[model samples]
Target: QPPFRTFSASDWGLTHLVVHEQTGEVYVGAVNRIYKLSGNLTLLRAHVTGPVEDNEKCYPPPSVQSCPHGLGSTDNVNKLLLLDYAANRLLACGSASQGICQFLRLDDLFKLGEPHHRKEHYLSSVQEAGSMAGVLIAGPPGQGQAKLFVGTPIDGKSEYFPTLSSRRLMANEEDADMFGFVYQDEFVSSQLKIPSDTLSKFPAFDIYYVYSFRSEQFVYYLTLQLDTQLTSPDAAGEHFFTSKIVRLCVDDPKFYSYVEFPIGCEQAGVEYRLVQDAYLSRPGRALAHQLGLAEDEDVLFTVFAQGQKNRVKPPKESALCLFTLRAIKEKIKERIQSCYRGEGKLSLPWLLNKELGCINSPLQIDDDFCGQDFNQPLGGTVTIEGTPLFVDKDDGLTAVAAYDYRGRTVVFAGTRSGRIRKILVDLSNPGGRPALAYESVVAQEGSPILRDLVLSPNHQYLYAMTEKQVTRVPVESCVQYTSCELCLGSRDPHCGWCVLHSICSRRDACERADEPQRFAADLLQCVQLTVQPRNVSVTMSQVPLVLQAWNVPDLSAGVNCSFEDFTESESVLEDGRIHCRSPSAREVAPITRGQGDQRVVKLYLKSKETGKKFASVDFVFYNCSVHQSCLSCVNGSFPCHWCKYRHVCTHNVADCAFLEGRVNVSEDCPQ
Candidate 1:
């Protein structure tokens, strides 16, 4: 599922998102605006960066005092970076771009493992535009391992204060902040060639993302290449939409250190491998530690389905792709050596490599490599090539998030059309073969053109980003399933049917009592009741598709209530209780509300506007119980109310009693 709450920021598109280090509040940056969302996904504050400090804005360059434009919403806080943790200062911006509006924002970089305070100073002016890419890691280059790294589009033709960065720019920071460049001219000249190819036919080369993986705490770089076209990939007018991934070593700063996937296998005296560009591969962090390995050990990896594209045969559908860090690194080594050994130094990188014979490669001393040599996860492959009946509406795979589970890989993918599916990836063989099963749709209602996917450390939440808003959903809001049978039937690893409590619990919640027992490893053990209880619509996303009620009734008071979600068209009231009613699935099971009980249900509403200081609905339920005995009410399971004096259920004040009074004297009991 997507985020339970989606704090909508503006009418314009949102460019980046960051979670507060200490408070869990999410900070969203758009074209020129900033929004602070509470941990619950509620917007606590919203401000346009250009607003004068006197206008109550917290970030920006104070030097902009006498500009002719008067700061008219042109500060594109396109990305986010944590600069100082103890001081809690975050550096954000497209910092430098074509113009103020076109700053190449690093604002989106997430140095995942770095320690941070979730709390941001509500008032502080951090940094300004013209800041280059390599200028912002919290520590020096040779300092404690890179908490994370940044990758950006750097061209050799640019200058000292170039569009992104210049060859001259690194000259000053090599000792302190030196890092490798993926699309640098010097590097491409050594191993690759400049092609006239284009994806949509235009000059484009940008680093969409730079991800990190570890081998005993040493970082390896996987740069996601985007909006690139190399004429060598295919026939004229048939440029591939497929993107490619480039691998580099942080310790090895040579221009030729760049390695690509399967570098076109040699066949019939020709090699075949697609080379083009945005594959952001993340180190499956959870899975890494789960294997009981040290921080320095190599980790598992997953990426944008584009990274898994079959260059020889591109699929129509985009998918959630996974592979091993080892296989990719291994492939990198195989191709680099093969290229150097077979004697193809200055040809269409793809064209020349295609004809180059393999030396250390699997096939033969001069045999061809195939698309199969590149590691593609079972889910990404099968999903893109789906069966006829299993139609997928998504035009392409836009975003993905993954984590390691007991023995399976839990993957979440968002389609270009804004649909999200939770998939459990079980590897049958190491990066060679595996199985993928579709779990459930994570998001179907919000923005379909999802721009990014951010998964919380514990795999409990998935933040789905759209150009305009951020949707925060629980990975598995198990409580929405009314029956145990329904819970297990859903097949979401994040959910489990509790036997001891006869309720639906989150995945691995079985050991929540701090007991010696491990979590529910078997679904059979999770299942208790066989009844197919009516299902209630459960949404973990706070994306503002519906309203958020900040306060819920105290369940111990025997409210027997449930919250309902509704769309504008399917709004309906059922039997006085708020039950989730959808046009597609209206068969709701019975859950009580106000019966002899004087109205046990209530409705909630909210409007995301700047005028409102906060985005939350506070429902004031007036509990006025008539009268019933406390002992009888506490002892029996009846809905009979039992206060210190009177408790059948009324709006009277005395219905509320102290802790010592609830069970002492109650109503309706044989005892």
Candidate 2:
């Protein structure tokens, strides 16, 4: 009916909006707090207090630091990192003094409980080596228990500085250098194998970049260790490079047992010793690394990230290496079997289908059909038949990817100029080609940068939150290049043809004849001229009481008496039947009835086209209780009825038996 309008909020910039599935409520992530909104986006309530702050405790000394840069309090909550509505937990990350990570009940936002009344109620701390940039809540592999995995940045800023200092101080010392941190209790037991020394320095350096868990009860923690140069002194920047993925059994609470999933380089004919970055998909099963194709039973898609000096750029271009999870698992099993046959210790491969991706947050490509297009049989190689639906040129647009609501199409890719181009893939199509269907101005002109892009559940809207205000755009509006035809009111039966003027007059005139009539009948037809042909029909009927009056006439004469004789007779002939003129023929008399027995008059009609039964109306008149008279004939004060044999109401008429001398009316008749 009208052009689209924009909706703006008066509060802080809207960062993200997530729908709570159970209550159908929306949670809006703003700059410092989360606001709850109704279905129509009306603000309900705010769930956060003070500035967004991190509760993380810093290392060296476990003391809480105030907000960084003195922006606000130590609770300077930055981003609503992850929300597990199903599990009723909210995970938030802040750049507080020590970098805070908070895990509180979702209901705490509604003040439903005092879950965060005490510091211990919520998991808050900024422990050194525990700085969390990204956080995801997941379950242990095959186990259903929930766990939290916080992704620290790749540089290991928390662990590196302390280790370097410790190495220098303990040179030539006999005791092992104790500069790293490890999980202490049940939480650590469930997630890691080596509880006491998960982060200890080997002869080589150890760095656990990111931690993640899967729904299948599998815990994946990625690490990059550098073996020390035994012959030479320790260099400031030089260290032995070794990247390994450790898969721990979530079901087992032991901290020293693990199965290392093999990496893509191991599966391939290479021995690359570097893992620049890693991310795990939100679903937890799939992993995407900077190296090659995604591994999930089979190679779903391939991506190459050319390492760049800028942290925002994608990795360098590489080949579309196809691989799958089943093949990698089979190969690892074969190796393990061979090691067992040789009576040697069995150490699992460092790379498995589950270990390919970056452990921070993997890009999720939601395909339409799982078994058909995605999980199709690719001969015996366990490789995906399709290529990655690329979104942009080699500008590294592949960093952030998410599926549209349909879960079939993927909306991802960044532009070389920092604009984010969303690519839509048709899962039904055989070729894995991504069509550039949507684009949002993310980076300023010439400032090529991209952050996170998410699609609304209905696929009707897209939200791309960048360094600036989150951009909101309609999906169809951006895809107008493909087809611009407007399909509104195309095949709807109820939609009438568009006319220049109002049609109320035409409709009213055409419908009047069909209106039922109660009084005198009138047949009237009306029509109007217009461009379109219209159908009009009408019917008429008379009211029952009006029709009944036409059947009765008034007569106050007696039998064998003319009207003159009855008028002059001593007996006025009240309440008796009267003759018109002859003595042989007597007019019938009318009878009065009680209130409930008042007569009902009937009226009928017939169609003009077919002369068939069309419609009927009935009018009923009852005696009024106050007046005790027939409603229709109240003014006359006379009892009224329709004569059965004659169409008249006679006042005087001698009874037939009396006229024949069988009964005497001389004394019985009322005078």
Candidate 3:
């Protein structure tokens, strides 16, 4: 409400972001609702995955008893929706209905799914709508490729595609080796390698983010691989705290198809893929490269974190890592393509690569191939450059997103404290780039940890998700400094000084063909505006004086008053009020408006000339807690104010508690 557009829609927490290729519209999901938002942040429509009762029932049938919150608990899997272009539908799956990768029509169904149960009417023909299954992309999400081909008479002449299952990772069948995908349709399988000396199988796999690489013909899967390291590491090493990046052919349906990889900083010869409590954040590979916003880049961004002991205490630290799409693909090709050169008993690697005509005349990959013989990252090829290059300081990073700002990779990182930062990885600055320049406390402190950070496909705004609200911040709002001294000092990359306009603007806005020497880092270097005037309205924001949650001392954010951006002539009235005066002073004229949450007033500083315009900064009035005396608030009326002790001042206690502590113990509230 303080200039930044924000919305706290009840119960809407969108986790994943999908952009329609043809329409370029945005889609995200909440509990059971899928919201399609326009470029202008308009709520295009909301579609339900299924009827309200459907979610209210037990799912997959069995997990029902063990489910802590009943059948509706599957909402935990409420994360992403993949665009199935080839099929012209949405591969939407989550924890609802137990498990499902329900494929349904793709469009605005604002009222169609309403009255709830009718959702079944529209989604009545679902093939994998979670009785006991959840659909996960064996390939990267938004790959624009059809995996399974169930082409009916009415269905397009479909041939082979991928399989649909609720469980992401399932053990292959042993004795009943009837390997026919829908009688030779599409049945896919997976077995990967890791970089460490660890174990075999994962009881289950939960994918974080999946992306497809068309030109490279491979898909990357980001998952939190548990027990990834050796069951035993020499003391100092930490096992089970790993994040792995696995690659597979977008169309391959073989056992060894997964090329193993690990991401994170390498130190003491160990690779830490991802951290304890972390998600892959938001991926922009398709945008980063296709738009040519960056150079020589074939990578995706990642962030890592875990829960803190205290909810309000800021996190000590967090990390941001980048993994290469190009690098992983190249490693797979080299490792497998030549896997056939020489072999002993025709190993799994040889068959994974189809080397030496693996399973040639009378050979078939049996249970032995899936056995524990070969494990990879149980892994594969490692990226020489795959590592955590950036470490977010002060507040731990909870989520991430990015934009190709003007040409550089501008990363938007959100913190546990509900603050978002704009980090610039300036390629042009070899010596001084890749830094946290601008910061915005979008949500109040003590708010829930940021759950998701999504950049709109159109690149005009950033959507931040907390446990409760979806706040939208304008990508263009960072440039209102109005002066170079404030601009450069602020360190926000989107800002620069426009010599012509004498106003601060986005870097691109300051650059004009008509004015070659326009923008500057220092105000003195640029020419002043053509006009000079007496009255100018100046405004800036400051934290309220007395806002606190945890048991910490008052940290004052200075409150300085001025008449002309910084007034000079005045006499200290001392104690009761340090008053300043000019020769034009007559008598104090008190003018006030509004109640509770706000205040607007006319308490002009004495000025020499009456013709000159009068300017004043709006003072804030914070509401008192209900626990505080209602009598004092009533003594104060609706938006009553109560200092910890007891007082009915117009302004809140902030006047007594800046950042370190209040300067004026009792500034008179003359309303």
Q: Which candidate is the best by TM-score?
A: 3
lDDT of 1 at 245: 44
Per-residue lDDT value at 319 in model 1 = 35
Q: Per-model C-alpha lDDT, please?
A: 0.37, 0.32, 0.40
Among these predictions, the greatest lDDT belongs to 3
Model 2 ranges with Cα > 4 A deviation: 1-80, 86-89, 93-146, 149-188, 191-215, 219-246, 255-304, 307-394, 404-411, 414-418, 424-452, 473-479, 482-671
Tens-digit per-residue lDDT, 222-291, candidate 2: 4443433221243444334433444433333333334343232322332233333232332112133322
Query: Tens digit of lDDT per residue, candidate 3, span 545-629?
Result: 2111111111121122233433333333232232332212111111112243333322222323222222232322233333234
Question: Comparing candidate 1 with candidate 2, which one achieves the higher lDDT?
Answer: 1
Q: Give the TM-score of candidate 3.
A: 0.54
Q: Local error of candidate 2 at 430, Å? A: 9.5
Q: Write the per-residue lDDT of candidate 1 for residues 1-671, one digit (tens) a residue.
A: 23357566555567666565455656666655656566667766565544222221312233433333233334444444333342244444443222122111223332212111111111111122111222232335433323223334332212211222211112221122222232344323111222223322333433323333334213344333332333343334443333334443333333333333322222222221222112233334444444444444443333233333343333434333334445444454454444435433322232222323333324332212222222211001011111111113245555555665544456666665666666654434365433344454545454553444666545567777777567776666776665545676765656665433434676456434233212233445432211111221211121112222221211121111123343222222233222222222221123222332222222222112111111112222122232344443444332333445333432222445553334433433333
Error of 2 at 20 (Å): 4.0
Per-candidate TM equals 0.50, 0.43, 0.54
